[PDB]
């Protein structure tokens, strides 16, 4: 109902000496309220842990107002005799932002100092909310190819 969350480009090439690369994500055709889109890096042939690339994960905030978000990845300087590297970026399913996780929880616990008031609740409100859930595109995956370009060097001279 929300539209298509997906990468602007299915495959992106990033320079060895760029510093930080940013991938623009396509927002839903119908931007409704506030939606969070989680993401993470995937080690393809690239070394993770800040070895070929600084791996990252987090959440992007999209809204009716927020237009595009970017994944910022620190591209690490080449190892020893590496030709090029590539890793993937996966954005997870868009999660509709509930503005109130805190609905209350203030009930008299008739016990002097105890933290269990026993709130016996279980509502599948997430499924109730999913009637208008934000969804993602056909294929959500970015192939990030770290290619050597010393022509443009992040170290300015």
Coordinates of C-alpha atoms in Angstrom, one line a residue:
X1 CA 0.0 0.0 0.0
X2 CA 3.0 2.2 0.7
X3 CA 4.9 1.7 -2.5
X4 CA 8.4 0.5 -3.3
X5 CA 11.4 0.7 -1.0
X6 CA 14.4 -0.3 -3.0
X7 CA 17.9 0.8 -4.0
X8 CA 18.3 3.6 -6.6
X9 CA 20.8 1.4 -8.3
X10 CA 21.0 -2.5 -8.3
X11 CA 24.7 -2.4 -8.5
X12 CA 26.9 0.4 -7.4
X13 CA 30.6 0.9 -8.0
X14 CA 32.6 2.8 -5.4
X15 CA 36.0 4.1 -5.6
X16 CA 38.9 2.6 -3.5
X17 CA 39.8 6.2 -2.5
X18 CA 36.5 7.8 -1.9
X19 CA 36.3 7.8 1.8
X20 CA 32.6 7.3 2.3
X21 CA 30.1 6.0 -0.2
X22 CA 26.5 6.8 0.0
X23 CA 23.7 4.8 -1.6
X24 CA 20.5 6.6 -2.2
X25 CA 17.4 4.5 -1.4
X26 CA 14.2 4.9 -3.3
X27 CA 11.3 5.9 -1.0
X28 CA 7.8 4.5 -1.2
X29 CA 5.5 5.9 -3.9
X30 CA 3.1 6.6 -1.0
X31 CA 5.0 8.0 1.9
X32 CA 2.7 7.7 4.9
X33 CA 3.7 8.9 8.3
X34 CA 7.0 7.6 9.5
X35 CA 8.6 4.3 8.5
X36 CA 12.0 2.9 9.4
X37 CA 14.0 0.8 7.0
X38 CA 16.8 -1.4 8.6
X39 CA 19.8 -2.3 6.6
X40 CA 23.1 -4.1 6.8
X41 CA 26.2 -4.9 4.8
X42 CA 26.9 -8.4 3.4
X43 CA 30.5 -9.6 2.9
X44 CA 30.6 -10.8 -0.7
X45 CA 34.1 -11.1 -1.8
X46 CA 35.1 -8.2 0.4
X47 CA 36.7 -8.4 3.8
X48 CA 34.5 -7.2 6.5
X49 CA 35.4 -5.6 9.8
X50 CA 37.0 -2.6 8.3
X51 CA 39.3 -4.8 6.4
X52 CA 38.2 -4.0 2.8
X53 CA 35.2 -2.2 3.9
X54 CA 33.9 -1.0 7.1
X55 CA 30.7 -3.0 7.6
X56 CA 27.7 -1.2 8.8
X57 CA 24.1 -1.8 9.8
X58 CA 21.4 0.5 11.1
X59 CA 18.1 2.0 10.3
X60 CA 17.0 4.6 7.8
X61 CA 14.2 6.9 8.6
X62 CA 11.7 7.6 5.9
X63 CA 8.6 9.6 6.4
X64 CA 6.0 11.5 4.5
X65 CA 8.5 14.4 4.8
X66 CA 11.8 12.5 4.6
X67 CA 12.7 12.0 1.0
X68 CA 15.8 9.9 0.5
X69 CA 18.3 8.3 2.9
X70 CA 21.7 7.1 2.3
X71 CA 23.8 4.2 3.5
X72 CA 27.2 5.5 4.4
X73 CA 30.0 2.9 4.2
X74 CA 33.7 3.6 4.8
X75 CA 35.6 2.1 2.0
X76 CA 38.8 0.9 3.4
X77 CA 42.1 1.3 1.5
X78 CA 43.2 -1.7 -0.6
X79 CA 44.9 -4.7 1.0
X80 CA 47.8 -6.2 -0.8
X81 CA 47.2 -7.3 -4.4
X82 CA 43.5 -7.1 -4.6
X83 CA 41.9 -6.3 -7.9
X84 CA 38.5 -5.2 -6.7
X85 CA 36.0 -6.2 -4.1
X86 CA 32.3 -6.4 -3.8
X87 CA 29.9 -6.7 -1.0
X88 CA 26.1 -6.5 -0.9
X89 CA 23.8 -4.2 0.9
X90 CA 20.5 -5.5 2.1
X91 CA 17.7 -3.4 3.4
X92 CA 15.2 -5.2 5.5
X93 CA 11.5 -5.0 5.6
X94 CA 10.2 -1.5 6.3
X95 CA 8.8 -1.2 9.8
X96 CA 6.0 1.2 10.4
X97 CA 6.8 3.5 13.3
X98 CA 4.6 3.1 16.3
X99 CA 4.7 6.4 18.1
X100 CA 3.7 4.9 21.4
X101 CA 5.3 1.7 22.6
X102 CA 4.7 3.3 26.0
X103 CA 0.9 3.0 26.4
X104 CA 1.1 3.3 30.1
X105 CA 2.1 0.5 32.4
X106 CA 1.3 2.4 35.5
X107 CA -0.6 0.2 37.7
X108 CA -0.3 0.0 41.5
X109 CA 1.8 -2.9 42.4
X110 CA 0.6 -3.6 45.9
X111 CA 3.9 -4.8 47.1
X112 CA 6.6 -2.6 48.5
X113 CA 9.4 -2.6 46.0
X114 CA 8.7 -5.1 43.2
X115 CA 8.9 -4.6 39.5
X116 CA 6.4 -7.2 38.4
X117 CA 2.8 -5.9 38.2
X118 CA 2.1 -8.7 35.7
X119 CA 0.7 -7.1 32.7
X120 CA -0.9 -10.0 30.9
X121 CA -1.1 -8.6 27.4
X122 CA -0.7 -10.1 24.0
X123 CA -2.3 -8.3 21.1
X124 CA -1.3 -9.0 17.6
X125 CA -1.6 -5.3 16.8
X126 CA 1.4 -5.5 14.5
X127 CA -0.8 -7.7 12.2
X128 CA -3.6 -5.3 12.8
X129 CA -1.3 -2.5 11.6
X130 CA 0.0 -4.6 8.7
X131 CA -3.3 -3.9 6.9
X132 CA -1.5 -0.7 5.9
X133 CA 2.0 -2.0 6.1
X134 CA 4.9 -0.4 4.2
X135 CA 6.5 -2.9 1.8
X136 CA 9.6 -3.2 -0.2
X137 CA 10.4 -3.6 -3.8
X138 CA 10.7 -6.6 -6.0
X139 CA 14.3 -7.2 -5.1
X140 CA 16.1 -5.3 -2.5
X141 CA 19.8 -5.8 -2.8
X142 CA 22.7 -3.7 -3.8
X143 CA 26.0 -5.1 -5.2
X144 CA 28.7 -2.7 -4.1
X145 CA 31.8 -3.1 -6.1
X146 CA 34.8 -1.4 -4.7
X147 CA 36.9 -0.5 -7.6
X148 CA 40.3 1.1 -7.7
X149 CA 40.3 4.6 -8.7
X150 CA 43.3 6.5 -7.6
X151 CA 42.5 9.1 -10.2
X152 CA 40.1 10.6 -7.8
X153 CA 41.8 10.4 -4.5
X154 CA 40.2 11.1 -1.2
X155 CA 43.5 12.5 0.0
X156 CA 43.3 15.9 -1.7
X157 CA 46.4 17.3 -3.3

